[PDB]
Design a protein around this nucleic acid. Sequence first.
DNA 1: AAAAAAAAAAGGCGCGTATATAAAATTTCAATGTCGCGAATTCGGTTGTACATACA
DNA 2: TGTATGTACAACCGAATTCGCGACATTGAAATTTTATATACGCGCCTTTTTTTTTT
Lengths: 189, 92
Amino acid sequence: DLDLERSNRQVWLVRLPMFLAEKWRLGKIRINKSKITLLLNEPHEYDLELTKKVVENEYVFTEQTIPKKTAIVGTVCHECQVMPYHKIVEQRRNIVKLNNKERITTLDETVGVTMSHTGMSMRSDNSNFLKVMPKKEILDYLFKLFDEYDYWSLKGLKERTRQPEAHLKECLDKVATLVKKGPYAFKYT
Amino acid sequence: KDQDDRDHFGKKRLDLAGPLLAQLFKTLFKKLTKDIFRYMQRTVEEAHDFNMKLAINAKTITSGLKYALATGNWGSSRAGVSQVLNRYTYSS
DNA sequence: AAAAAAAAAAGGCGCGTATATAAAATTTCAATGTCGCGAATTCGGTTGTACATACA
DNA sequence: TGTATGTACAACCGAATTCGCGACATTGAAATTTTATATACGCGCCTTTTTTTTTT
């Protein structure tokens, strides 16, 4: 169900140097006939250079198997890139070639204090991280659970009845169907 | 164009101590990564108590290098890379 | 200036360390002890054409 | 003259049948369990005390 909003919206994609694109995450195009220029919004004045006069087979679409809400914005009308005021742009450009990154912090303490710690600091678990029956009463309960459930499991009876296991099984041995084989295994009906 | 000379010196590189330790270190660091993971896996898989010093066996590295210096054995897979220094006379 | 409230801190307190003794009652546990699961294995019936051959 | 018949001798097929690992359940047991008492240390925790802070 693809939709075509315009497919004809003339658009000029541009490639940019890093700073302005980063600053772009307005202006005024002063076309001069064809020394096209642009008066940016305050900041510098960067003209327009014609990276590619005519641009084809390239269009703008949108998104919102699984299809999605997709529309056709328009065709790229003409490609441009940028001429970047200038010396400062030139200065920062050459200045940009002067990056850096961290080296190693050696440990300025003397070593006993640094090295006493990773052995026997005497302190542990500072952080929480992966710190991990009556014969009558048993028979009445066993009959009840069997009456409550034909699949009255023995260990489940033991856990639920909270009675000694030997007394519960004796209760279930005669008051319930002692099943240890078959599809209904561990079921006392 | 001619067959490439494979001996033009420019196509050589010299894995000095720096890059060589990298090899030795990097791989030996894996032997750390695996092991903790192993023990880590165990303690949870048996709800034991998470202790750090058991968790990381330090020797895994220190024993690795100290050995792999002490003899040019470099893994095996290579030898002749570490020598006693030759203190005969200065130029030597 | 004064009352009042809030908070820190101090100190002694109880049986978790040791140890010997008995009592018993629970809990947990370890050392085998019976239950299915997929693979492993061998037998004749069917079929088609030949080929002789006889009733309709 | 068309047909019915007994019998063949050869390649095809699937049908039906019996072996051990894993799941736990088993009972076996120890360990833990609670109590007195001296010893002393060192866990933490109780209340109280005192102090500090705030507000009127």
